[PDB]
Design a binder for this molecule. Structure first.
Ligand SMILES: [Cl-]
Ligand code: NA
Ligand SMILES: [Ru+3]
Length: 129
C-alpha cells in the first residue's frame, strides 16, 4: 500500500506515534516520506548485507528476522516480511522499541538529514486528524 500523507498521519496517530518519546506526529510522517515514500512494500539492501523493510525502513541487523543477515538479532520478534503489510501495526510497534533506545529518532538517518530542524509540523497541516 502507498499511503497518502494525511492517511498515514491519521494511521500513525491511531497506532500511537503522536508524541511518542516526545516526537510529535510530523517527525514520523517526515521520516516515512524520505525512508519509503510512504510505500509499505519498500525494501532496500545495505552494503553490510542487511535490508531495510517497510514504511519506516526497519533494519534486519537488529530488529527483525529475514533469514539472510548473518550475525543479526530479531529484537522486535517478527519476520521482516511482517513489516511490508498494509497494516502498519508491526512497523509502528517495532519503531516504538527502536526510538526508546538512547539515540531517539536519529536511528533514522533520513530523519536526521531531512526532517530534524525543519518544520516537521508542515507534514500534517491540512489533514483531518
Ligand atoms: Cl532500522
Ligand atoms: Na535479524
Ligand atoms: Ru535504522
Amino acid at each position: 500500500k502507498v499511503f497518502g500523507r494525511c492517511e498515514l498521519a491519521a494511521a500513525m496517530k491511531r497506532h500511537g506515534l503522536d508524541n511518542y518519546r516526545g516526537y510529535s506526529l510530523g517527525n514520523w510522517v517526515c521520516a516515512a516520506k524520505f525512508e519509503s515514500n510512504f510505500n509499505t512494500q519498500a525494501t532496500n539492501r545495505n552494503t553490510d548485507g542487511s535490508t531495510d523493510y517497510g514504511i519506516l525502513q526497519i533494519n534486519s541487523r537488529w530488529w527483525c528476522n529475514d533469514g539472510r543477515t548473518p550475525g543479526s538479532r530479531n529484537l522486535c520478534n517478527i519476520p521482516c516480511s511482517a513489516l511490508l503489510s498494509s497494516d502498519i501495526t508491526a512497523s509502528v510497534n517495532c519503531a516504538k522499541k527502536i526510538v526508546s533506545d538512547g539515540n531517539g529518532m536519529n536511528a533514522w538517518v533520513a530523519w536526521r538529514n531531512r526532517c530534524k530542524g525543519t518544520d516537521v509540523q508542515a507534514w500534517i497541516r491540512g489533514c483531518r486528524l
